[PDB]
Design a protein around this nucleic acid. Structure first.
Ligand SMILES: [Zn+2]
Ligand SMILES: [Zn+2]
Ligand SMILES: [Zn+2]
Ligand SMILES: [Zn+2]
Ligand SMILES: [Zn+2]
Ligand SMILES: [Zn+2]
Ligand SMILES: [Zn+2]
Ligand SMILES: [Zn+2]
Lengths: 151, 149, 150, 148
DNA sequence: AGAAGTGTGATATTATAACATTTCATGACTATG
DNA sequence: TAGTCATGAAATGTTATAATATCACACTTCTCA
């Protein structure tokens, strides 16, 4: 049974204490707001949610928080949109993942892919290309959306 | 002259399909071809203003849309940027993009295995995938030698 | 001592009087506005701004125009989609008549407090709550008339 | 009342020897059915239901004709077009009162303003060809909504 | 001191919405005549 | 035997803003000598 949202937050607090990094109230609040989402969320949508608690929040507030949360591996940037999602796999050591993005209902599943990382290394190796990071993002329809089509 | 050939080839493909490769569109294509690899729209607009001083953002974006709709360029989603497709006349294809974070060069490769892993991974879930975005950041060969010294 | 210096100093003073930031970028756009004979489109103004600020893009000139509009420093000429420096920043808000030549493109700002009153009376008859008047005349200026006579 | 103006328009396009085509008529019809100002591209959307192959030049050529006759006025400060109050009168200068909340536009006469403008021009060397007179604010209805 | 964090206004970058005209081909009623 | 007038259809020009992201400064704060 996968790690719960709440367990991911506890784990984030303790990981930051283990590293000597400061999971501040803002960064924490930003983190939980993202955990509440059923998928990715844009920075300015996130800013709007943040305002309900902290009305004085501006874009720098959100972006600083996201940068920190990104550097610590709690959040991933979904590049093909311009959105951000909670990482559901930081309890393990740092990882490769592939994002599966629904175009209509907007939800995303993060799924590990060992074979993908390796194939990309293999393609990178043949050319003289020192691969550093992979971006794997899939677009289509998720299960629930498929059964709305069947109507 | 590799550019000349490349342009002559695009004029031919656009003649085949009932489609207008206008001077403006041709010019943008020429500029990107001469570019090593990736280039932002606004850097491309700056170059375009050499030949067309009145060019504005819609000008460059309209040309990109055209060149995107035909097979000639790809968006590089992880750097808001654009590059020539390495082989034109083929239909809508999923390619793996290896982008150099130092010099902007981009090698477009086939990645059948990746598509097949995502194909099966989507199938074990209820996911019906239309398109994959596969982009790798790192360093190209030349820049690898340079970073080692 | 020069009109432009004097004019910018006035603006610097008013913006201090009001607790409001006349930034270098806003200063530069205003400087450019003041060197124009008459009216200039936002994009012609951007090209000029690019000479001093090569990175300037459309939002850059639109923000600066919005600021200069909020304050009393420039007017929008609605019928030609362009912008002119206000002749006198000294006044508060004001209704101003704009005489626009459709040959040489020049624009001349005039007062007409009579017009304010007529419009306020007309709006008052109906229940209308007036905020701004747009009053623009199109024709040929004196100069263009001389030329056209030959 | 929509059909009354359409017939009246053809009458006037007989007198002045100019061809009110079905294209122009259709736009005039659509302008009439609208009870207020409308943008060219919103007008294009409506023209497309009748004539799906219509494009921006289609609507602008039409508008240019309807403008050059008496039939429609441009609202310069909103980039939109409004049917004339009544076009049996001699080519007149409208003064458009424009509600910034509901977008209602009320055409009024303001000879006082035109008179003043002509006098100002006269003192300069200005050959005055046309006046644009437009007010922005809240219509009566909107004032009462805001009063609550 | 000194490194990290926040508040605030303005600015920078990427992309598209909204408005209007140019272009060129092509089929339509007319000017003498 | 052309002459203006009208339309059709693609692309372009023009004006303005949406959507996304960072910088610069001032004040702070918790930390390190
Ligand atoms: Zn993850
Ligand atoms: Zn879905
Ligand atoms: Zn390709
Ligand atoms: Zn490289
Ligand atoms: Zn003024
Ligand atoms: Zn003149
Ligand atoms: Zn009227
Ligand atoms: Zn109203």
């Amino acid at each position: 049974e996968k790690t719960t949202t709440q367990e991911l937050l506890a784990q984030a607090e303790k990981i930051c204490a283990q590293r000597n990094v400061r999971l501040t109230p803002q960064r924490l609040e930003v983190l939980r707001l993202m955990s509440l989402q059923d998928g990715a969320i844009s920075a300015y949508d996130l800013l709007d949610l943040l305002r309900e608690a902290e009305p004085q929040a501006k874009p720098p507030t959100v972006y600083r928080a996201l940068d920190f949360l990104l550097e610590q591996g709690f959040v991933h940037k979904v590049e093909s949109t311009n959105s951000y999602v909670l990482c559901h796999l930081f309890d393990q050591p740092t990882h490769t993942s592939a994002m599966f993005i629904c175009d209509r209902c907007g939800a995303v599943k993060e799924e590990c892919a060992e074979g993908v990382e390796d194939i990309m290394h293999t393609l990178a190796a043949k050319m003289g290309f020192a691969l550093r990071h992979n971006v794997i993002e899939a677009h289509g329809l998720c299960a629930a959306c498929v059964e709305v089509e069947a109507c």
